[PDB]
Design an enzyme around this catalytic site. Structure first.
Site, short mmCIF file in Angstrom:
data_model
loop_
_atom_site.label_atom_id
_atom_site.label_comp_id
_atom_site.label_asym_id
_atom_site.label_seq_id
_atom_site.Cartn_x
_atom_site.Cartn_y
_atom_site.Cartn_z
N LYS A 171 0.86 -1.32 -0.14
CA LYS A 171 0.05 -0.20 -0.10
C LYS A 171 0.69 1.21 0.03
CE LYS A 171 -2.37 -1.05 3.71
NZ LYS A 171 -1.63 -2.29 3.87
N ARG A 222 -8.78 2.13 9.87
CA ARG A 222 -8.27 1.06 10.12
C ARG A 222 -9.34 0.10 10.87
NH1 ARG A 222 -2.88 1.29 9.62
NH2 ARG A 222 -2.08 -0.89 10.15
N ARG A 278 11.63 -5.70 4.99
CA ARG A 278 11.48 -4.32 4.68
C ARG A 278 12.68 -3.44 5.34
NH1 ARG A 278 5.55 -1.48 5.67
NH2 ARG A 278 5.87 -2.20 7.72
N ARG A 327 12.47 -1.79 10.92
CA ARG A 327 11.70 -1.20 12.06
C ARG A 327 11.32 -2.36 13.13
NH1 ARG A 327 7.18 1.39 8.30
NH2 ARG A 327 6.00 0.05 9.54
N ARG A 330 0.24 -7.73 14.34
CA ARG A 330 -0.57 -6.80 13.52
C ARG A 330 -1.44 -7.63 12.39
NH1 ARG A 330 3.21 -3.46 10.44
NH2 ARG A 330 5.06 -4.66 10.76
N1 LIG Z 1 -5.59 4.37 11.22
C1 LIG Z 1 -5.12 4.02 12.17
N2 LIG Z 1 -5.65 3.87 13.54
C2 LIG Z 1 -4.90 3.35 14.59
N3 LIG Z 1 -3.39 3.09 14.66
C3 LIG Z 1 -2.71 3.20 13.38
C4 LIG Z 1 -3.52 3.64 12.21
N4 LIG Z 1 -2.38 3.79 11.44
C5 LIG Z 1 -1.33 3.59 11.95
N5 LIG Z 1 -1.45 3.19 13.28
C6 LIG Z 1 -0.70 2.70 14.24
O1 LIG Z 1 0.65 2.63 13.73
C7 LIG Z 1 1.31 1.44 13.32
C8 LIG Z 1 2.12 1.34 11.81
O2 LIG Z 1 1.13 1.60 10.99
P1 LIG Z 1 1.47 1.47 9.47
O3 LIG Z 1 2.71 1.76 9.10
O4 LIG Z 1 0.24 1.56 8.76
O5 LIG Z 1 1.33 -0.17 9.63
P2 LIG Z 1 2.05 -1.29 8.52
O6 LIG Z 1 3.54 -1.65 8.75
O7 LIG Z 1 1.01 -2.19 8.53
O8 LIG Z 1 2.22 -0.32 7.37
C9 LIG Z 1 0.18 0.37 13.30
O9 LIG Z 1 0.42 -0.80 13.85
C10 LIG Z 1 -0.63 1.19 14.29
O10 LIG Z 1 -0.42 0.89 15.74
N1 LIG Z 2 4.46 -5.86 -5.46
C1 LIG Z 2 5.81 -6.13 -4.61
N2 LIG Z 2 6.34 -7.05 -4.78
C2 LIG Z 2 7.36 -7.37 -3.93
N3 LIG Z 2 7.88 -6.61 -3.02
C3 LIG Z 2 7.11 -5.37 -2.66
C4 LIG Z 2 5.88 -5.12 -3.55
N4 LIG Z 2 5.30 -3.79 -2.96
C5 LIG Z 2 6.00 -3.55 -1.75
N5 LIG Z 2 7.15 -4.53 -1.79
C6 LIG Z 2 8.32 -4.34 -0.74
O1 LIG Z 2 7.38 -5.19 0.43
C7 LIG Z 2 7.52 -4.33 1.71
C8 LIG Z 2 6.16 -3.75 2.08
O2 LIG Z 2 5.91 -2.71 1.12
P1 LIG Z 2 4.84 -1.47 1.83
O3 LIG Z 2 4.52 -0.56 0.89
O4 LIG Z 2 6.04 -0.78 3.05
O5 LIG Z 2 3.75 -2.26 2.55
P2 LIG Z 2 2.26 -1.56 3.44
O6 LIG Z 2 2.64 0.00 3.08
O7 LIG Z 2 1.13 -2.14 2.78
O8 LIG Z 2 2.42 -1.93 4.73
C9 LIG Z 2 8.39 -3.20 1.54
O9 LIG Z 2 9.91 -3.49 1.97
C10 LIG Z 2 8.55 -3.14 -0.29
O10 LIG Z 2 9.81 -2.40 -0.79
CO LIG Z 3 2.96 2.38 5.19
#
Ligand SMILES: Nc1ncnc2c1ncn2[C@@H]1O[C@H](COP(=O)(O)OP(=O)(O)O)[C@@H](O)[C@H]1O
Ligand SMILES: Nc1ncnc2c1ncn2[C@@H]1O[C@H](COP(=O)(O)OP(=O)(O)O)[C@@H](O)[C@H]1O
Ligand SMILES: [Co+2]
Length: 203
Positions: free
Chosen positions: A13, A85, A124, A150, A161
């Site tokens: 995403k 979320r 990642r 991270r 998660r």
């Molecule tokens: N819309 C939301 N509502 C509540 N908590 C959130 C939201 N977006 C992010 N968070 C908090 O920040 C953390 C990291 O979010 P995010 O980067 O979206 O996770 P991911 O690794 O799935 O991309 C989430 O696990 C949550 O604890």
């Molecule tokens: N289509 C894809 N195929 C393979 N790896 C991907 C793809 N999209 C993202 N990634 C890798 O997988 C990880 C998750 O992507 P990310 O966009 O951070 O996830 P989200 O935002 O859904 O939590 C990142 O390290 C990224 O570089």
């Molecule tokens: Co993100």
């Protein structure tokens, strides 16, 4: 126009949203990115959020809803990336847009299997100087470039998660499918391919 990117952690995403913002001038709202800035700055939101995040839990609805109010731009197309979320978050988003004569135009659901999300997240890596996101296997950082992993990308937290995503977030699928604005995306494919499909969806 207003899009929501919905789906499990690691589905890609953020990668897609940043790409879209950059090339088509969307305003990218990443609650994950915003929250991490806050935590790192020790703001009040930052300080309260920290524990939930570290632990792979959701930050409480009111805090996040208020955060959105703060950052929502007066003009521009918007990609909501990581928000809503929960169902309460989605209901509040609808009412907020409404008061502005706006609405969610498309919800893109990034479908990808549990097996694949574990491989995406565990691999990642982040460039702490620029915040550019990489992956050991699919888009590896240039040699000699320092990157971090991270904390919440650790196996135990990833597990939590996913669990949290299935319990609280997954019901948003039915919520939006009900409105007839849910489009399915095959997030398993390579980046370029997932991207072309995102463009086709949004016309
Ligand atoms: N819309 C939301 N509502 C509540 N908590 C959130 C939201 N977006 C992010 N968070 C908090 O920040 C953390 C990291 O979010 P995010 O980067 O979206 O996770 P991911 O690794 O799935 O991309 C989430 O696990 C949550 O604890
Ligand atoms: N289509 C894809 N195929 C393979 N790896 C991907 C793809 N999209 C993202 N990634 C890798 O997988 C990880 C998750 O992507 P990310 O966009 O951070 O996830 P989200 O935002 O859904 O939590 C990142 O390290 C990224 O570089
Ligand atoms: Co993100």
């Amino acid at each position: 126009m207003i899009l929501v990117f919905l789906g499990p952690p690691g589905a890609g995403k953020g990668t897609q949203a940043k790409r879209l913002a950059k090339e088509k001038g969307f305003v990218h709202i990443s609650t994950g990115d915003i929250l991490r800035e806050a935590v790192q700055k020790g703001t009040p939101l930052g300080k309260k959020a920290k524990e939930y995040m570290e632990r792979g839990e959701l930050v409480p609805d009111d805090l996040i809803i208020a955060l959105i109010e703060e950052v929502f731009p007066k003009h521009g197309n918007v990609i909501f990336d990581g928000f809503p979320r929960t169902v309460k978050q989605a209901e509040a988003l609808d009412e907020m847009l409404e008061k502005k004569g706006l609405k969610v135009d498309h919800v893109l659901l990034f479908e990808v299997p549990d097996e694949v999300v574990i491989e995406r997240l565990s691999g990642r890596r982040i460039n702490p100087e620029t915040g550019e996101v990489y992956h050991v296997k699919y888009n590896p950082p240039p040699p000699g470039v320092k990157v971090i992993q991270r904390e919440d990308d650790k196996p135990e937290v990833i597990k939590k998660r996913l669990e949290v995503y299935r319990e609280q977030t997954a019901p948003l699928i039915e919520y939006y499918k009900k409105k007839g604005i849910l489009r399915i995306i095959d997030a398993s494919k390579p980046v370029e391919e997932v991207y072309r499909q995102v463009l086709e969806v949004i016309g």
